[PDB]
Amino acid sequence: AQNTFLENIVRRSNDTNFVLGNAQIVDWPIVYSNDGFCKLSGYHRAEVMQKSSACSFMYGELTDKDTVEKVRQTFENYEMNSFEILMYKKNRTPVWFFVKIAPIRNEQDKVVLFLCTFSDITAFKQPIEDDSCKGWGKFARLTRALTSSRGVLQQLAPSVQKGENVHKHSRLAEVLQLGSDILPQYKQEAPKTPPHIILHYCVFKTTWDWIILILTFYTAILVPYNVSFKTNVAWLVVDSIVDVIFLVDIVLNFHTTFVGPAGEVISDPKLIRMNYLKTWFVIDLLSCLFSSLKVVRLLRLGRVARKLDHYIEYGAAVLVLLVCVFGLAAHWMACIWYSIGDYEIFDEDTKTIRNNSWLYQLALDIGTPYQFNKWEGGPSKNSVYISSLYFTMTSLTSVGFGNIAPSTDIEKIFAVAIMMIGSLLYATIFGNVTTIFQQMYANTNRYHEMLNSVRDFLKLYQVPKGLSERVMDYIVSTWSMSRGIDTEKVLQICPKDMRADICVHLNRKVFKEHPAFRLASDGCLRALAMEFQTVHCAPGDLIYHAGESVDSLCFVVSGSLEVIQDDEVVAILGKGDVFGDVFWKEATLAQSCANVRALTYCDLHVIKRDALQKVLEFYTAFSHSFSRNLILTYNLRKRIVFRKISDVKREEEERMKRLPPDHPVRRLFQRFRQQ
Amino acid sequence: AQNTFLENIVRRSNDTNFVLGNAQIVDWPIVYSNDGFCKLSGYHRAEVMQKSSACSFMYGELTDKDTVEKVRQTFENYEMNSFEILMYKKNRTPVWFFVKIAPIRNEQDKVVLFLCTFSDITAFKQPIEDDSCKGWGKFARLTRALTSSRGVLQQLAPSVQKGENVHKHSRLAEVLQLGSDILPQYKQEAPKTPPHIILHYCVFKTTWDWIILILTFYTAILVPYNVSFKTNVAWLVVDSIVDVIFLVDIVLNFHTTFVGPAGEVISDPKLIRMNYLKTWFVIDLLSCLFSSLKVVRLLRLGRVARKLDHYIEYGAAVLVLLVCVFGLAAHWMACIWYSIGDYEIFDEDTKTIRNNSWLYQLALDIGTPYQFNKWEGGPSKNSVYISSLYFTMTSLTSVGFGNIAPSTDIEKIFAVAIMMIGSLLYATIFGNVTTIFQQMYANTNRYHEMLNSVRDFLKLYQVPKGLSERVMDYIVSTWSMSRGIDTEKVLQICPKDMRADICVHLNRKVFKEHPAFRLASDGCLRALAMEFQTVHCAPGDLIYHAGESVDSLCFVVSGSLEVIQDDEVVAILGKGDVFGDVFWKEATLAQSCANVRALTYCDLHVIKRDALQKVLEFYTAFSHSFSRNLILTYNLRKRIVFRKISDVKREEEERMKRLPPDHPVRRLFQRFRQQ
């Protein structure tokens, strides 16, 4: 989803110059000029912009003012038109421009821009000079001006005569077909392929690829079973059905889109055809095709290579893939095993059984042995396939019972083959199970490693039982709350815009509730929220000590706090209360008067003095509003004088009961008088 | 454990306004006012706080002073009362407040706060104005004041008449029931559920979940054994016993607490019932329930899913879980194997044995074959279960001996099934063993990797044998001491309060023993200990070179040091000796006069000059005490002049033995005279 506005214009353009103006701003200021307009006008892009889209700076005394009034009327009524006006350049040469002005709509169908396309009718109108070396020189300057039409586009004209109307019609007809083609509408819309070209990540294409994965699995089950065991007519019916489906997939893989390394999407049918024909098309056509060649239908699962990169990333998905590959290879080498047994049981022209094959031993094991009439069969075909899959499963699972077990020469060659293949299939199943378990236990074991390091540290340094239980409680609580998420790292992945917007959403509990912040600009809100820090505190986990530096005013967005000065609660802070020190007015660091113990699990939103002062020095219009609207709930700097009632009572009891010292004492008293 | 003091008040309150005062501070200063009191009083929270809890700022000339004296008596005797007083607002409107004053106890049952709850009796007393637009306007202002009672709570009153006493009784009876309900006592107590609701992490509930895990294991062993092998009356007795226990678990899972993603605990019985009925209750009731349905008692181990998240994290615990799951699945598919053999041995109505099944081959193997009378049995039922568990264990362990080995059609279908299941069970056992070994060898192999990098570095850069052995000795010694604990990282996990308190405990060996630090404030102690660095040194591993910058005064908290100036020991530093340079008085960096070699394994506690100067500039009252009480044991800055006895002896021997040079020499001499 993008707004590919300019790219459409320069794609359809073929070297035509244009500028864009506003359709809602008075005098219609130029917002964009392409480089060809900078070459044609003789100006920079900086001096062209914020001039009028009617090119008022190119007007002159030779310009007809009624054409100017028609152009301004065209801008006033928002209609497509075209005009031919003598306008000036930066070197003031009279140039007969062909303008083609067109409004540009919105997604909401409101006109928002004026696209005006430019060309030159200098050679086709007349030469006029205020002063020149020659009439020939004025003609030469006119031919050097009118270049993009005559020298490039209208090249079949100047051999022929009477070409003025024809060249004007060609140059205007390019823009006239563009008047329906380039209506680019200035919308951030989704990029589209031409129709009859289906998308790669489409829902229909995804379920189509899933049902063709199911059908490749179907054919890989059934085709070796058919060619090995030599079996109705509904099976040929569904064979024709799945062949039709695979040829429909041939057509769909011809018509689909594609992802390359540089091109994230592919839109062109010749591009997808050239990408198709090298790799995929020849093996898929070799699959989609006398009976002995039917094994090449096993190349159908070559297109499961396309699902390869869909599900090669996920560990459980590649485990499910390898379990299916294990069972499929079991069926394949079961069919190979039956083919070997059926070869070996009647490899002799003398019709001898040789008394030794897995087929004959399976028959003699289960009953119904072989006998001749002819040569009457022994075991059932379904029982033979069941036992053959059983044998191949015993050899692939490395179980190896040995009921069905190889006993002749090519049987043991195949046994060596299946065991060396099944070793590696069993190993790769074990490897993906181990990889699944390590990638599913890594985030647990790193947490347990951090926790064991902390427990060993607090055991080693003889930290007391209360403080160590406190630290361990904090660590398990913040892990259970945060789910092991480094919030700084998750912010660092994002760019600066998303980082600021995420931080504004995190500190919305301050910025929507405080009257100091209800006047904040959007940029000031970003610049504040990038320096805010949300701080969670446990009950009894105090924030400021007595005498600690108060460098951070905190907004209690959740929970409750108490302010203990001299063992006495002085202020309870609730939801949406601001404490700390008034930094912008104090301009000095002070020690905290009082402890700030936390009553409940509380969420504060602190902000350091240096960061807040940076933001308030940069947003000078906001800083006065902050100073006028942020009343601190509790100044931690100011000392609150009081008396305890118990001490006042005891002093009243003592007042009811009741110069050599004064000379080293009144001195100090006078010092306090000077204080 | 928290002190949910305000939340209880605003939960029971239903929009009643209140302030809190101190019960031990004279004049009873307001420590908290809710937002409704800010709306009612017409003030901010900042101007209300530190005023008296009797609302002295709202007194006026129309206020009766004897009601004031009764209120101050109520504050003096610490008793619950209620009063109706005309008090002023910020816009000085006379308001008939209903106060309800109540003391608030402690966990130690001492009164510590005054909660006074507020309401309006403005409409119910009288209109009185100093000046007004109208008596009707004064009535309108009174109706706008008395809002929270009449417009909201007392809404059944104003249709009826004679409602004054009734509305006053209702508004005071809310607070009168609250006078027993909200006695919130201001204690950091544990949060409690209502009784007959049992805790999640409780010790009784944990051992209950463990015995029900044991019983689910019991039923998963016995129920397939029963339904497969078709077995007294004490077994039905213990069946009824365990069914009673499972229904007791139904009741307990109805009445327990619960943990959600947002809610860490759940206290409500309707909440736990609604959480129960979707997922757990329907499958547990399907479990806790003609004989052919007994297999659904295997759904009892669905509640072992609840222990899932108790022990899915620990690697050895999930290995023990998977070993038990392996053995349990062995027993299950052993029962399935016996059921298949018992089906296949008499699948014929002709009572033929077919000469081929694992049961018949096991009978013919071990003796006592099958014979008919009727059809007399072969092997013992216990021997059949033993051999069936043996077969299923051979197929799950991928051993596959082949005594007992499948030979018929559905037997080999089951064999393929058990081998494909046992492959993945064997793989996941192998994966958890590999994960256990990697997470138990990671902290060893990262240490060996660091040590190998160091040995390769000291081999590569041709560092000499003595220095390389020294570095390697340091590295293995600090690993054996620290157990591989990044002390900076373990501090960084903690918040600022716990970080400071841990650092104060780490530097307690300085802060309890030094007379310079016995005057330190608590905040100054935190601000010092966050910048202290404990430094361990090896014997012969010197700290300061000759001429090195002395930017850190060190406290030798353990071990002994020697100070070598010019190959001569000048001072031995023992436990609790401070050396370095007197930074606050010097205010310049100097070179060290002498080497400071370490005698034993010593622990110093250094602190850099810049950090110490920051702390002493911020704690100006502490800095003078530090300067007066910290005598440096050895000034490393000052040069100590002396003479060696051997050189004095040799010079005495030479003194007993004994202008063209002076002109380039006496000049220098005079320079030294100007020095």
From Swiss-Prot, chains A, B:
Motif (Selectivity filter): 398-403
Any one biological process term the GO annotation gives: potassium ion transport
One cellular-component annotation, GO: cell surface
Residue intervals of the PAS domain: 2-82
Glycosylated position list: N355, N373
Catalysed reactions listed for this entry: K(+)(in) = K(+)(out)
PTM note: Channel activity is regulated via tyrosine phosphorylation/dephosphorylation by SRC and PTPN6.
Function: Pore-forming (alpha) subunit of a voltage-gated delayed rectifier potassium channel that mediates outward-rectifying potassium currents which, on depolarization, reaches a steady-state level and do not inactivate. The activation kinetics depend on the prepulse potential and external divalent cation concentration. With negative prepulses, the current activation is delayed and slowed down several fold, whereas more positive prepulses speed up activation. The time course of activation is biphasic with a fast and a slowly activating current component.
Family affiliation: Belongs to the potassium channel family. H (Eag) (TC 1.A.1.20) subfamily. Kv10.1/KCNH1 sub-subfamily.
Descriptive protein name: Voltage-gated delayed rectifier potassium channel KCNH1
Native source organism of the sequence: Rattus norvegicus (Rat)
Full protein stretch here: 14 to 720 of 962
